Write a protein that binds this ligand. Structure first.
Ligand SMILES: Nc1ncnc2c1ncn2[C@@H]1O[C@H](COP(=O)(O)O)[C@@H](O)[C@H]1O
Ligand SMILES: Nc1ncnc2c1ncn2[C@@H]1O[C@H](COP(=O)(O)O)[C@@H](O)[C@H]1O
Ligand SMILES: Nc1ncnc2c1ncn2[C@@H]1O[C@H](COP(=O)(O)O)[C@@H](O)[C@H]1O
Ligand SMILES: Nc1ncnc2c1ncn2[C@@H]1O[C@H](COP(=O)(O)O)[C@@H](O)[C@H]1O
Ligand SMILES: [Mg+2]
Ligand SMILES: [Mg+2]
Ligand SMILES: [Mg+2]
Ligand SMILES: [Mg+2]
Ligand SMILES: [Mg+2]
Ligand SMILES: [Mg+2]
Ligand SMILES: [Mg+2]
Ligand SMILES: [Mg+2]
Lengths: 476, 476, 486, 486
């Protein structure tokens, strides 16, 4: 078989479990054989619409069978898939389509308006039209080092992370090594497949294991609770906010959750209170740390250590290597702070048409996360902060997230930011929404003096749309 | 991490589950951390004994922790491991050591006599001596295309199958894709680790998943039954003969088997009667077809189809491609006979220092199994016979195994062999152990005339040590 | 340097010989310094026009600096170059553009009309020299030797040969190993650069060596002779028909040829007449055999061995392996006929979008030439015919070239071609198509009767049809897609 | 052909120029045909003696056909060649054999005693020419360009540079691109083949081009001159000390040097005296800079640019990238000092069994030269000193070569060396070690007092110790492991 990439997956799965159900969405159920044939038809269709090896095909739409069909079809046509972030403005879609140089944009009816407003040598086709009339799979030569997809990463305009067929395959291998999945898996995907997390951590590994991927086009806590008991979901991925919204809904206590085997949380660390609430209900989080550039898995905190290592990001996935390094590039003394750097077959080729930006951050197979961390005696990592947020005050490092985290012990939302100073170069400045007074004096009971902000401004709201933004700087 | 091969596995597993038990043998229990440190010490030890990248280290001994320690140590030293078949004569050991050019032979006390009789620029050291006094892992550069081990294949002298770190890694990925293993796996290894089957199908995948490998230096049906209930085994690999011996032992009915989740059978097809007996007891066989040259997995018949497709070899493992091909090299019309040929990342680099012999059988990534087969409408394969046993009679193919299989319906053991003929070029000759008469007339009720042997010789015993041999030819 | 491909060549060469003349075209000369600045301006320009890694850029025009600028600019932009046969009509160009999926076409002004008529909605049509951006700093995109450099179309429908950066780099290494080029070469490219021959055998190796490529937009033997003595050409590539026209020109005696060091001849063998005419003016041919799919070098017959091994295609280039194989695939009894099969780092990735057609001719890195040949005890290859021109008649093979060779011995046969035609008795039978000399009269029955004299009856065509002209390539090979016409 | 490595070179070359002389050594000449038969006999012989893929075979002896036979036979047997420094004592050879893990040692008869004293239990000791098997059919084992061809030991303890088949192949491509070699080269190898210079810059490229390698077992300027005029040498490699001894010989005027086309000089820059002495006999040096770990080519200063860019190490070879980097790793303000870092397919796999020492100097395919240098506006490199010879004195850098350069200007300083010596005030301070001319008397205090005249006080050594001779390499570089002696 000449196609070694994701394009071949539907065909390989169909030889193994043709009649097993692969995708559920509204009333739509696709078996593996139905997926293979629908993929082979869209591939031949992209060929006929003039798609050639290395060409980019964008998808603008929600979690939906068309997402996976476009993904596998691209692979089958030797093309590069581009899953757009469906929440972005026209200017931003335009930027993503210009940069990737997409030659075809496949979209769902609800985006038809927005698609018609996009900047003219792009073939914009509604999902289902482009599909052709052969349903025998193409077998084009695709190696694992060939780019499978461009995933745009939000300090500059967005950059396309080049994830190879190899990157996503080896990420799925990592998941199968560290988590226990089976043939009879029923995985609920209510996080977006346009993020590496839903796609890499749950969708692809469930399809590869011959289980069922249940897609929701939207996140609703209630639909997720109903889905869990009605569909007998074994496997869910979410970010803390999605598990917060689920636990907080009226039917949290009423819903039957005995079917859940594996609850994956990524994106950010699970707050202690949230982990405790799921634990109280018999549910333990597997916590993942990762990034787009690692396709995305890097560290796993297993359900056994979730309580024993509170707000650890965990240990390396099997085929990855992870270290904390200085600016010096060398490993730091254990317990000391440095930058998480990642290496392995899951790590990206680079940023699409940005080779210099790539070289700042990728070198000798090692990717710079932009995360400050410590490694404890047991090789468990502890994320401190974003290296970009770091304040330098009389040559001493201040991690806002440490100072912020103390401010939250005070009787809503806060940001600590760097501010020029005539003699220290930079000094802390707390921005707080509440009912006030100068209790920086409380912070002086809690922090190294030099870490305490020298000023505190009260406000009414902060740019907290992130679901906080360092545009707080702009309001110094 | 520069070592991408099996040598790195103990270190990667120890970052993940240090305190979980990896190996049980007599009273010996090794945790992953204990395995990593023991491996790092044997690696440094091999270095100090003058082992350099690409050097061969042989192991002569039974299933035992020293087997895995030598395997991982070789990998860690950038060396090539050579697991000898412990049942072979001195002349045959000599041939395997000459051909591989082993520079170190590590052995267990019981083989000390035999090792002292071996032909003088070989360093012969008992297991445990060579071990050194650093226990920090070496990180030498090892790629997946580097040879991990030489596995000798029984029509000529034995040939060393070069299995790369890549071959064994991708075989383990295949196993994790098609079978459901967990962190809490307890796998019994009473088949020899010097075969690709025990090593590739069970041992490596169980270690990679963070479970426990229970080794028995010998096959005893009784010890296996006791082991299953006393140790709570979830996972067993065997050949039909080993499952035949287990089911036939006094304590078959008495033994508690509720712990068994996955029963793997390989080597040959499970006789209907044997599959039925395990089924009657609630136990379903996953059947594997494979060969040394595929590291070794190729086809899987899952527990769901074990009854529905009796004596099918099954469908391709996910990352493999399998076809029946003519001498013409092309796929054959469905249902027609041809040679199973295998392709994929599990398939060997070639036979050690035999490039011409390799080229007869490996070409464009495709390996010739030497197995005649058919593929049915559902893509399920059916092994007919060994291409080498095929008889050509007036230009028509006779598969002895088909004729033999009819002879076994007659009221012990039989072989059908080719025999020169003045006008047909070759003709059948049945060799039977019983009480006789010429009931080739019964075969004429059952077979195409041209397939019926033209003569039948009765005998007392046949070379049935294989646990039949085409040395029956020699007694034409 | 992250770009290992041809896109990095102008920057690697500008570091060593910045002020040496790289390209001469009439009154225009680029130094290596200027080539690198122009290539980098065009690569930036292409990217501004939406060119991204793997996109296809086509060039329509003759031998021109813009050919080499577009080639190198594509590599620098991580893109794939598509050199179009500039003699094609718009239906054939439409096919090449659609199959390739070119999203940009650069053309010289004489193709403005052809370009206006192309099937194009998502093709940017650009006149050469209108996409030169302000930024002249070389881009350094990650490009490996296994990345595709260009699609070169075959003469079924045209198939796009995927030549990698490695394929073309290793062809140049083959040329440097077997031919003696120096930093003062003055190479005349009067054959088309859209063929592998001029590009791979003369153009790129000369640029690699810091030499001067002299381009002619067209072949005129009179321009070639003026150029050799005026420009002191050291190196020429041509097919035998070019070298014939050069020798049959009135200024062949008066032209100073003393500068000529290396005469490369490919496409077909040099007739004994041709060798003799050049021998007597001191000039010997290095004869090469190759194909598009080997980028293109495979065999060479050097000037030292043209004497004893007459009509040989010669011996393998250093990094290339060459064999004659059975219809099986297995090597043949030495002396007997089989197919030339080629292996090495010069051999293509496969045909673009045509994986099944690729697998029929490319397995285990061995390419099926479609050439029938023998190999002698000395490893010298002898090309007999094209496999697909074979005529099977009562289950015996007939080699038409053996028959055409005999037909040339008959008074007033100026050109001919023997094709397979269906027949119920024999499956196939030969038909001769013969072009008579303008001042010669030929009886069909006498011609056939005379062949029967010379050949086993099974080889002799059953019929003869006369014509004024046969379908010949720009070079002068008979298409044999005159099966269609008779 | 499954062997892509140097092991296949004798068979690839026997196909093209079988009867051309490949190697001449006094009265012995091998044709390419005979080299291939001998290499194949030895490869079979090695395998009979238990040599398998990846095993190490060492050669102890001078420049000799057996060097090249063992090299190519190792490749053909899938094995790794270990060319030992034949000037080493048995403790240093024992180290090289133990670190390499050689399981076979081929030696010429003059090393019979040294070889008898080696620490060996599992080493087969073999006299050259005693492992020639009957089978002369080339083996074709699978060998990739990334397989290790040879371990070349560094001058800590010696480190084994893993040079791949690719590394050495791509060095030869670099040589063919930048130097004008032809099939009639007659290359004199009077420098040792156990160094990368003679092997990679002259020997292998000449064999690739179907030329003749003329080997001398020893360097004697009188033999070199006789050989040039008698053998009509076209190509020579040497370090400046070899070219100095050749020019200071009585038969330099009477020797016909007219055959010389290419003079390659590596190791160190040619003094202005040397260039002038060769200029006046019509001869110009192609000057190369390189190291073992780049197989070894990196920079070249061609004869066309030796005039204006005096003391330059020149510009990068075509397939090699070269930069000056901060202690950071980042490129430096142009004109300022940093370390030469090298990238390209010629750069080694790493040091054998020494992955940590490798990672200190080799990341992202960039190798740290240990050379301090500047680059000018023209991309020409200027080597200043070795990084590890730097003297840090009150946190200021002192370049000893800048100080030794000034010391050479003082009456009767024949040789000298400046080393770092510990000091409590400044961390480090310089000490001069000076060899006086046999007929010169020098006051230490006056020498230092005069340096103070010429240099900032912080650069001037605090002490001077006199000696009769300094530790110099076979070439003539000062070891600087005279730190040990003073
Ligand atoms: N489990 C986690 N714990 C803490 N921070 C995390 C975790 N997962 C992701 N992050 C943060 O989010 C980044 C990933 O960004 P993205 O590629 O957009 O998913 C990481 O580099 C961290 O800064
Ligand atoms: N499941 C199976 N069914 C039938 N034959 C098998 C099966 N597994 C292995 N074999 C046979 O045994 C061979 C493997 O030999 P070995 O490499 O020694 O294990 C295959 O090529 C088949 O001939
Ligand atoms: N020297 C030659 N002698 C005979 N045929 C040749 C020679 N050079 C090229 N050819 C033919 O031209 C074909 C390549 O065509 P093309 O790829 O279009 O250049 C070869 O496969 C041969 O059939
Ligand atoms: N042309 C040259 N000019 C200056 N130093 C050189 C030159 N060629 C070689 N070297 C020095 O020799 C080193 C290589 O030593 P080796 O690897 O033992 O040949 C380089 O790193 C330089 O320090
Ligand atoms: Mg950039
Ligand atoms: Mg053989
Ligand atoms: Mg000029
Ligand atoms: Mg096709
Ligand atoms: Mg033409
Ligand atoms: Mg000679
Ligand atoms: Mg070390
Ligand atoms: Mg020396």
């Amino acid at each position: 078989m000449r196609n070694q990439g994701l394009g071949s997956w539907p065909v390989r799965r169909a030889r193994m479990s043709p009649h097993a159900t692969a995708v559920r969405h509204g009333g739509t159920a696709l078996t593996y054989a139905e997926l293979s044939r629908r993929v082979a038809r869209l591939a031949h269709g992209l060929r006929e619409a003039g798609v050639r090896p290395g060409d980019r095909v964008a998808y603008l739409g929600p979690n939906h069978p068309a997402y996976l069909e476009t993904l596998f079809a691209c692979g089958q046509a030797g093309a590069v898939f581009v899953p757009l972030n469906f929440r972005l403005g026209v200017p931003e879609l335009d930027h993503a389509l210009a940069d990737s140089g997409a030659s075809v944009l496949i979209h769902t009816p609800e985006h038809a308006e927005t698609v018609a407003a996009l900047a003219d040598r792009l073939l914009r086709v509604p999902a289902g039209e482009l599909e052709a009339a052969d349903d025998e799979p193409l077998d084009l030569p695709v190696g694992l080092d060939d780019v499978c997809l461009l995933m745009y990463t939000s300090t500059g305009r967005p950059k396309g992370a080049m994830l190879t067929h190899g990157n996503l395959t080896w990420n799925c291998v990592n998941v199968l090594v560290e988590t226990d999945l089976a043939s009879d898996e029923r995985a609920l995907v209510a996080a977006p497949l346009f993020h590496a997390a839903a796609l890499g951590m749950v969708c692809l590994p469930t399809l590869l294991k011959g289980g069922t991927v249940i897609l929701h086009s939207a996140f609703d806590p209630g639909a997720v609770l109903s889905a869990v008991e009605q569909e007998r979901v074994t496997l869910v991925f979410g970010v803390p906010t999605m598990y917060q919204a689920i636990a907080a809904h009226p039917r949290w206590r009423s819903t039957d959750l005995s079917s859940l085997r594996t609850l994956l949380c990524g994106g950010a660390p699970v707050p202690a209170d949230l982990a405790g609430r799921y634990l109280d209900r018999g549910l333990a989080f597997v916590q993942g740390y990762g990034m787009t550039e690692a396709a995305p898995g890097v560290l796993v905190l297993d359900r056994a250590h979730v309580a024993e290592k509170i707000g650890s990001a965990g240990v390396p996935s099997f085929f990855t290597d992870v270290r904390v390094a200085g600016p010096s590039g060398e490993p730091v003394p254990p317990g000391e702070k440095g930058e998480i750097v990642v290496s392995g077959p899951n790590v990206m080729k680079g940023y699409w048409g940005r080779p210099e930006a790539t070289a700042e951050v990728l070198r000798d197979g090692w990717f710079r996360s932009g995360d400050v961390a410590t490694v404890d005696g047991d090789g468990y990592f502890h994320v401190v902060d974003r290296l970009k947020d770091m304040i330098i005050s009389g040559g001493e490092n201040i991690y806002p997230a440490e100072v912020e985290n103390e401010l939250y012990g005070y009787p809503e939302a806060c940001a600590v930011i760097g501010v020029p100073d005539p003699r220290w170069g930079e000094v802390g400045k707390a921005v707080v929404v509440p009912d006030g007074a100068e209790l920086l004096a409380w912070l002086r009971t809690r922090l190294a003096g030099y870490k305490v902000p020298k000023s505190v401004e009260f406000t009414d709201r902060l740019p907290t749309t992130g679901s906080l933004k360092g545009e707080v700087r702009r309001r110094f």
